[PDB]
Symmetry: C4
């Protein structure tokens, strides 16, 4: 109908309830399930779907060998029904590429896929399932984007791109699209030193993204965007509760405008909901690998450099593999407020489980509840020995 | 369009005709069929679908090993087209959980799934395919529900929940939902001592549920609900024709307000249509196991403590496995009256057929006819030896 | 919209062109294709679909063993997209049964399935995908019907049923349904001695059915129905070109009101288009088995007891297996006349190819052309050796 | 709604971006993917789909043996969702045949399939998924058509057919269809000596087709059609940049009205966009086999007999297999101009890779961009050794 506007604030998050789980690897042991990674969830006004970057082969197929690799001509952004596994027969291809983002503006959906060699990549913006705009690499070093949904307000959908070094200063740009066309783009501003894979959500006409500083920060950079004025700023989450991975152990005081040192040249896509005392951070339990997953309520984490957890919820036990995580919300649900949601990618295979030659994942997603619900852990559930 | 109202009475049931049969296990021997249990049937104004609790694996898949277990993070309520098998590719996930119920109110469908650890479970109510309300465990002992469809009248859909001991007194509540929100809830009232897995239907603005007394009764408890006043009462079916399983042999006189003794701490979900002389009871033929299935016309079974069968129909021969059974009706069919229907779960595998390591089922469903139709038996049809 | 009326006459048939072919057995050698038999084609106002009686198992599945049998609790009438194979995932179940018919009346579709033991079978009439009417066996000896589409005119859809002996006089009835309800039924009238599996079509407010006299005729009985007056009559096709199978060799003069002797207690479902000089008969090439298939133009075959072919078209070579054949037309196609069509069931497996333990089929269908098109043969295409 | 009219001109082509890729062979190694060849892409006003000629078997199925053959009764024109593989379960059959074309006129789609023996073939024209017109062979020697989409203007859709010798003069006709009926047909006019498999596109009320001279030309014939006047003419592309295969090496000067000699009795379907200086030609890199694929900007290639490349883009490396290629455009996309697109068939198996007994393909498609995007190569991606 008309363009969606971010007119509501976030609901109070007292706990998280189970939303969707596909059990892809369990089912894929004996079904035609596509090998994937970098999944996410995104909603249309009438349906919410699972999304991911396919590797162009099934798990049981011989071409699954070598799927640990990130970029190839055989990947594609695919979407499929909520909680179903990504199968060959029920998956819909959005575009061809090894990095992506996608969001509905209220009228129709925009999907962006980046493909190419490392030094000659390009993004093609699709709108209403047709290619509309193309952007060539500007720093000639792996043009990349969010790997989770973008957000729109009155037709304008900002998207964060990064091109250049992953272990040094790079060139990040914020593009403001409307109906697939570029209205404007800015270079990154603020105090963030490195930006990659931003996880965004919107409320009260403002868009907040929690990204990944791959170069030096263990605390996460944040970009706040004003989609009306088409401007932005960046900083780091102040809290000592560090959320990247790998990372040092938590200190007693954090850093607001500088990366917290400890781990270099590595990280993981993550997210957070920054809403005053209604603030929740997600993170792997392990400080060394993508293992376990928990949510921690850290009041004023964004601005308080000494803030520590007041409540928490374990999503995946530390004995189980996790991976990327990002944010999404059903902006078309009924209600007085936006219910915060998130997904966790559960990676199986290489590099950790090297008895198999593939790398894939399943998905688990939760949304917030105003009740204080009991918790359960949500592992992938596949027994790797069954694949030998 | 508008909320459905239970304005009709039941059609005269002179016999039962075949409605749907999926042959899931036969087909699943060489197809990507999901392992399930606790199935049921539910109608929307334009289509009737099969429902069940998936185990998150196919029958032929290696993860089918251990599917005898009731609760895990890999189960989900799924629905699929009438008489098709529950396949990986044609199944739609309604919600994540190991216990459920679901019903259409005329405008849209409400689905409820309960998940969690035994002592920290929670129910999340979905309406129009979006989560709306959440309820945390109140007795911290396996919060559970119907495992068959609920029923609505002018927007109000009562649902019976039980939390607490399965072998002792528990806390049963009747929740009255409207558009996924809680209007009110009551503690169980009346003479029923234990309630579990209620099978409900509605007619002339009243909802009747035939449940399971797992603790001590071999006769079934009944809950009658008034969805307008939002009140209820309970008692037991008076008839000496006992319908739980396992159970003692039929006596000459039954009990109206007390459980009929004989078997303790066990049972099976079942149902009945209580309509004066137009009363039919369903039951396993075997008094010891979930074997065989028959329908018996027992006039005034609800109030006559000496009532015995006047007519009958064998659905499944005693040499064949049966299982859960419940009620449903197409409230949107044309006609002067509601045609009574029911389904029978046909369990294959463990614990009875222990040569295989899995437990699954197929479904058979019948609806009433005013004609006196000839009978046939409807077994699962799978030869277990084919799975070794 | 409104009920369809048979207001047109048949187009001139100068030859036949290929309409649909599913190659089910070829594809089913390595795909989840259901085992079937007794297929047919039927159109809705917006789509034409393939129909058949499933055996409730795939061809490669172990339960395919024994599918030569006609009646069991595992059969169901299924429909699927034109020219696709009947797969587990794309097939829609219309009803449960081992004998059927189905037709669209312009508003919605009626499907009838008969199930039961030989001496206690029953038909349940579905309309708009809901059961509406049920009919119990009247002669207690395999209640059976058309096995191809029925035809409607202004809401009235006659259907021919037969109950009783297949090798002696039986009780045939013509039921006139409207919206799934019985308006009236008649006992068979005219000179036909035995009727089974009628293949019907309609034109200019009259319905013609070419059936099978299993008892003694090698010439086919014909039933002409007036759907307005709801009356009918029957006779045999006069032509010496015999069309049942098995059958004696063609004589020089046929029989109009008596069965032509030669073969007893056997036959095959077939059809014909009887339209004065625009008359075409279909038949197996072999007089001994269901092998080969050809169409022969035999002017005035219905009334001329000496009529012989004036033109012909080979559909399946005598070295290839054929089987049942029946008529259907797209009554909703644009145009001044109804284009005659037909399908041929291509049976593979038992009893002829006994190296395999199953029996299944694929389908080929053609429609008429006013051009004189070149001919090609259309075999099943599967190599049985590939299934050992 | 209404018939589409070719009112726009072509967008400026500065480079090509990736549009769709199905990775059919990679996925088909362990999925129910149909064996195909002769693919193409065609758009409806609301969706663009992949099309191809099925061989009626899956790649892994035993019937894939011998699929190198061109014509059989088991082929069919099938369509499926963009970038998905052609699977047994998601493919839609358009018609039965071993040669085809198809296009949407704005209101509905016309599909044409030719089937038959070499000396008695026939084309049946389908419109709105119903057969409407039939044309019998005129030269009795493999009646054949485009093997890529046709184009319409105000309801009129010209289609080029060829019947007769492939190594000598043949009879080519241009049929002008409207709603599936023949308005008129012409014999080939102009200087082209042999025409086969025309690849067409339209702009500013004119339709241009780049075909294949199988008899003697290494330069391609071109047919320009005026769909309003229903007339046409033909010539050869003047440029010395030869685009058929096999072919001699490029000369310094080409031929405008004669075939350029060098290779006899062979070729490959190809295409070009002829638009003054905005002219791009596609061709295999290899002059000997269907290997590699590149696009070359050759200003005024159609009329300048000395024109040479000014820019280029490699699509498939010469070390990778290619095959047929053709044109298509989304005439229903928003915008001021028509964005040129094309597809490349990537043949795997026989005759080049003879370790397997089958022949199939996958598809890659690109559309033009006004940006100068970086290039990447797009191979099939399957490792043949995995099929042994
Ligand atoms: C029924 O359901 C309800 C709902 O779930 C259950 O109640 C919930 O129970 C939770 C578990 O106790 C409880 O969560 C905890 O809440 C406290 C705040 O009250 C929070 O501090 C906890 O978080 C710390 O502890 C966990 C381990 O338990 C750590 O993994 C987590 O990261 C937090 O500790 C780490 O970070 C802190 C901040 O920097 C450090 O101070 C601390 O030393 C520790 O640091 C180390 O570990 C880090 C991670 O490995 C590492 O990075 C760092 O470098 C150090 O090495 C936790 O969230 C819920 O609040 C509670 N919910 C409610 C409503 O009550 C109930 O029990 C269930 N019933 C039953 C029977 O189970
Ligand atoms: C063509 O089709 C028609 C339609 O189906 C056929 O006619 C039908 O035929 C049915 C079979 O005879 C007939 O059903 C029977 O009807 C009588 C009432 O008239 C009913 O009592 C029968 O039910 C008892 O018998 C069956 C065994 O046959 C038991 O399984 C059942 O539970 C009933 O008996 C048990 O419960 C009773 C009540 O307490 C006890 O009195 C009795 O002793 C017995 O108890 C033991 O068994 C129990 C179960 O194991 C156990 O719990 C208990 O503790 C004891 O150990 C049955 O329903 C239909 O009424 C009839 N329909 C019509 C319209 O006529 C026709 O025959 C078909 N034609 C052909 C050739 O087959
Ligand atoms: C390009 O395409 C066109 C279009 O197809 C081709 O032209 C067509 O060619 C057809 C083949 O010649 C031709 O069909 C024939 O037409 C004649 C009438 O003109 C018709 O009689 C033929 O039918 C008899 O013959 C076939 C065997 O060829 C039999 O199978 C068939 O049943 C008919 O014969 C049997 O029945 C008769 C009637 O009772 C008996 O008189 C006769 O003896 C025979 O009886 C025995 O066989 C029976 C079946 O086994 C058995 O029951 C009985 O008891 C006896 O044992 C046939 O239809 C088309 O008419 C013609 N079409 C046109 C428009 O011209 C053209 O050739 C193609 N080009 C090339 C190069 O192939
Ligand atoms: C990042 O991305 C951009 C965009 O892709 C990259 O820039 C592009 O780079 C391309 C590669 O250099 C460049 O394409 C070339 O452009 C020139 C015109 O400037 C064009 O002539 C080239 O085409 C010839 O060369 C290729 C081999 O490289 C041949 O395969 C091709 O057919 C052309 O040569 C043949 O035909 C000519 C005409 O007849 C003959 O003169 C010539 O001798 C040769 O003939 C032989 O080969 C034929 C084919 O086998 C055979 O039939 C014949 O008989 C003879 O045997 C080519 O298209 C793009 O123009 C350029 N794009 C832009 C916007 O700049 C950039 O490099 C990327 N960055 C990095 C680091 O890679
Ligand atoms: C464009 C690209 O390849 N992005 C990478 C990403 C990247 O390596 C880091 O952010 C550092 O630059 O890391 C990872 C990762 O698992 O850490 C997966 C992403 N894979 C894919 N998006 N395909
Ligand atoms: C919540 C739960 O696990 N319910 C159980 C149910 C339960 O054990 C009895 O009612 C006694 O409490 O029994 C059975 C059963 O087969 O008897 C299956 C149900 N399984 C599932 N709903 N998953
Ligand atoms: C109801 C029934 O079983 N009908 C039979 C039919 C029947 O045997 C003859 O007409 C003689 O009565 O023959 C055959 C047959 O192949 O000849 C298949 C049918 N199979 C099925 N409809 N399932
Ligand atoms: C009708 C027909 O069979 N056309 C052939 C085509 C033909 O051989 C040449 O154009 C010369 O006539 O060549 C080829 C080919 O790969 O070269 C495939 C086509 N295959 C199919 N369309 N099925
Ligand atoms: C969003 O706001 C604009 C005006 O700012 C309005 O045109 C549009 O309709 C609004 N969207 C919705 C969904 O109401
Ligand atoms: C996978 O590929 C590697 C590298 O090509 C090879 O060594 C290994 O054996 C392969 N594993 C399997 C299961 O094919
Ligand atoms: C149900 O009853 C209410 C009034 O009690 C009415 O608003 C509603 O439309 C009725 N439902 C239907 C389907 O007529
Ligand atoms: C199933 O699992 C059990 C317990 O882990 C094991 O003993 C058994 O061998 C397994 N059966 C199969 C067929 O894998
Ligand atoms: C069929 O005829 C009846 C009147 O005899 C009419 O009501 C109906 O609309 C007609 N059907 C169509 C499709 O026109
Ligand atoms: C099929 O079943 C028969 C009879 O039960 C048996 O003899 C035969 O061996 C079976 N064939 C196969 C392939 O299982
Ligand atoms: C195409 O042109 C004709 C008149 O020449 C017009 O009737 C038709 O509507 C036009 N098509 C569109 C899509 O506007
Ligand atoms: C394929 O068929 C040929 C010819 O019939 C035969 O020689 C060859 O062995 C077959 N190949 C396979 C893999 O079946
Ligand atoms: Ca980092
Ligand atoms: Ca009990
Ligand atoms: Ca006969
Ligand atoms: Ca050539």
């Amino acid at each position: 109908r008309d363009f969606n506007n971010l007119t509501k604030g976030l609901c109070t998050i007292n706990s998280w309830h189970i939303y969707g789980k596909d059990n892809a690897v369990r089912i894929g042991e004996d079904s035609d399930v596509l090998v994937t990674r970098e999944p996410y969830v995104s909603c249309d006004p009438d349906e919410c779907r699972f999304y991911a970057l396919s590797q162009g082969t099934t798990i049981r197929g011989k071409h699954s060998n070598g799927t640990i690799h990130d970029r190839s001509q055989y990947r594609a952004l695919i979407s499929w029904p909520l909680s179903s596994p990504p199968t060959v027969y029920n998956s819909r291809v959005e575009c061809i590429g090894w990095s992506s983002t996608s969001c509905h503006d209220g009228k129709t959906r925009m999907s962006i896929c980046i493909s190419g060699p490392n030094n000659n990549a390009s993004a093609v913006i699709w709108y209403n399932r047709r290619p509309v705009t193309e952007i060539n690499t500007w720093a000639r070093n792996i043009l990349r984007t969010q790997e989770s949904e973008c957000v729109c307000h009155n037709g304008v959908c900002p998207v964060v791109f990064t091109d250049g070094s992953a272990t040094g200063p790079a060139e990040t740009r914020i593009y403001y699209f409307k109906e697939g066309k570029i209205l404007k783009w800015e270079p990154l501003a603020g105090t963030a030193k490195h930006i990659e894979e931003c996880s965004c959500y919107g409320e009260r006409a403002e868009i907040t993204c929690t990204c990944r500083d791959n170069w030096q920060g263990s605390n996460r950079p944040v970009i706040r965007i004003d989609p009306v004025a088409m401007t932005h700023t960046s900083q780091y989450i102040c809290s000592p509760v560090l959320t990247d991975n790998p990372r040092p152990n938590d200190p007693t005081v954090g850093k607001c405008n500088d990366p917290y040192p400890g781990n270099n040249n590595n990280g993981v896509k993550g997210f957070s909901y920054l809403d005053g005392v209604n603030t929740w951070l997600g993170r792997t339990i392990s400080i060394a690998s993508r293992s376990g997953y928990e949510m921690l309520k850290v009041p004023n984490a964004l601005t308080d450099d000494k803030s520590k957890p007041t409540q928490g919820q374990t999503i995946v036990l530390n004995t189980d593999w996790s991976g990327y995580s990002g944010s999404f919300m059903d902006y078309w649900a009924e209600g007085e407020c936006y219910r915060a949601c998130f997904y966790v990618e559960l990676i199986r295979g290489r590099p950790k489980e090297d008895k198999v030659w593939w790398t894939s994942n399943s998905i688990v997603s939760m949304c917030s509840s105003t009740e204080f619900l009991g918790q359960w852990d949500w592992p992938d559930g596949a027994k790797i020995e069954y694949f030998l």
